[PDB]
């Protein structure tokens, strides 16, 4: 009976342990048991794979039951790790990333379609393409 009255988004670097240091005060925001959150957290690390910081949806209720909904891994870490590149951008006149195949972008887009919605699936591939543009990531077929 208490849906949108307490909302917080968490889940940081999944290759770690009990979230007391980096997450602690954010959990103390409602008085949530950090360990109970850790039971959901560790069950979510083992859910897919560890080593990918993900953003989760947390909604703690009046009766201490919180709904955890994980999301898709962000393209920043995915394109960086899966393509095995470490360049990034910020210095557009000096530094940029090399090319990456469109199917590679599409395979990652396949994943995110399933999670992140819309109307056009090719536009979802274009969404990570937009990510690609600012980060310096060059897309090629």
């Amino acid at each position: 009976a208490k849906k949108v009255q307490a909302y917080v988004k968490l889940q940081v670097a999944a290759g770690m342990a009990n979230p007391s240091p980096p997450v602690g005060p954010a959990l103390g925001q409602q008085g949530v048991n950090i360990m109970e959150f850790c039971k959901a957290f560790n069950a979510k690390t083992d859910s897919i794979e560890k080593g990918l910081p993900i953003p989760v949806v947390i909604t703690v209720y009046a009766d201490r039951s919180f709904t955890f909904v994980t999301k898709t891994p962000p393209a920043a870490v995915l394109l960086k790790k899966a393509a095995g590149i470490k360049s990034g951008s910020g210095k557009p006149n000096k530094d940029k990333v090399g090319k990456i195949s469109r199917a590679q972008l599409q395979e990652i887009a396949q994943t995110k379609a399933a999670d992140m919605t819309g109307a056009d699936i090719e536009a979802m591939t274009r969404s990570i393409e937009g990510t690609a543009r600012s980060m310096g990531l060059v897309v090629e077929d």
Partner: protein, 344 residues
């Protein structure tokens, strides 16, 4: 290494402190707490990695005396050296500016002087082994021993970051090149290293806090002097210095002399301040070398050169006199960085 034991319990302690709901209230604590973690976690990982590798060695060390397990030993021993070498650079990570090298003869008179000659050589040779530079500005001779007192200017990169640990008296035991007999003596040479700090200057006045007054000049004259504000006083609020002047008739000619004297004042007092502070620093850095305020002993008859700050002795002196002290000073830096972690 015992100092590194304090290091790992400090890591444990991060688990307790970082995680408390009310500790975030103190922006002071929280920032400084996080500062520690940056150094803490990396070097703790460094040390815990070391823990595994180390214990591995002793269990497979004296095990059944088989040379096949020695091949397993062979593998990890090579790893251990290269591994801790990487770990050493992490710990060695500020001041790296140029520095003045002062080495002056202590107790021993002429032999004291002559030994400094040889000592000055090793640092200059050490500099050439690293291609910094070297240029002297003052030199005094002992009539047959080279340098009685010499102030050098070492220009380079990371100079003070290496030569910082040379502050003290150096004791040498050797057959002196001045003894008619073939006796053995003890001589002292004090070595001082101070960082080359910038000597910038202030705008000398900054006319926005200068309480300027004027009044009827006190002294001889006539009707003129009775009704002429021809005397100026400059009061400097940050220092609280007062300069009175009444020489010329014109206030501006008088204000000219006033500003001139006030110039000298603040400029000269600030230099005297730095001068006094530098000698303060220097006498608590040099130490009156009287055979007993040493840090390292260069013993020639036995070919040994030991250091007393970490109680380490080496039986390879010839290369040290040929300026290859990199080896020596590395363990000193390592020991101090170990105590640098347990300083907070």
């Amino acid at each position: 290494v015992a100092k590194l034991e304090a290091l790992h319990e400090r890591h444990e302690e991060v688990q307790a402190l970082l995680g408390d709901a009310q500790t975030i209230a103190d922006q002071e604590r929280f920032r400084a707490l996080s500062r520690e973690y940056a150094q803490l976690s990396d070097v703790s990982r460094c040390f815990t990695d070391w823990q595994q590798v180390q214990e591995d060695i002793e269990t497979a060390q004296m095990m059944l005396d088989d040379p096949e397990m020695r091949e397993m030993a062979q593998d990890e021993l090579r790893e251990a050296k290269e591994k801790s070498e990487q770990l050493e650079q992490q710990l060695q990570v500020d001041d790296e500016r140029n520095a003045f090298l002062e080495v002056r003869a202590g107790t021993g008179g002429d032999e004291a002087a002559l030994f400094a000659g040889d000592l000055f050589r090793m640092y200059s040779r050490y500099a050439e082994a690293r291609r910094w530079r070297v240029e002297i500005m003052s030199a005094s001779e002992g009539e047959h021993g080279g340098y009685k007192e010499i102030i050098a200017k070492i220009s380079g990169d990371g100079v003070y970051g290496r030569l910082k640990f040379e502050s003290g008296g150096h004791r040498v035991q050797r057959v002196p090149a001045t003894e008619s007999q073939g006796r053995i003596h003890t001589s002292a040479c004090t070595v001082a290293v101070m960082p080359e700090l910038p000597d910038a200057e202030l705008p000398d006045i900054n006319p926005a806090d200068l309480r300027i007054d004027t009044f009827r000049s006190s002294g001889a004259g006539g009707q003129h002097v009775n009704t002429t504000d021809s005397a100026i006083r400059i009061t400097h609020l940050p220092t609280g210095i007062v300069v009175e002047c009444q020489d010329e008739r014109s206030q501006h000619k008088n204000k000219a002399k006033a500003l001139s004297v006030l110039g000298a004042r603040i400029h000269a007092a600030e230099m005297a301040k730095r001068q006094q502070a530098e000698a303060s620093t220097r006498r608590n850095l040099l130490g009156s070398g009287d055979r007993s305020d040493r840090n390292r002993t260069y013993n020639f008859p036995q070919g040994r050169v030991t250091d007393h700050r970490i109680n380490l002795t080496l039986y390879r002196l010839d290369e040290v006199m040929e300026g290859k002290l990199d080896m020596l000073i590395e363990p000193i830096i390592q020991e101090h960085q170990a105590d640098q972690l347990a300083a907070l």
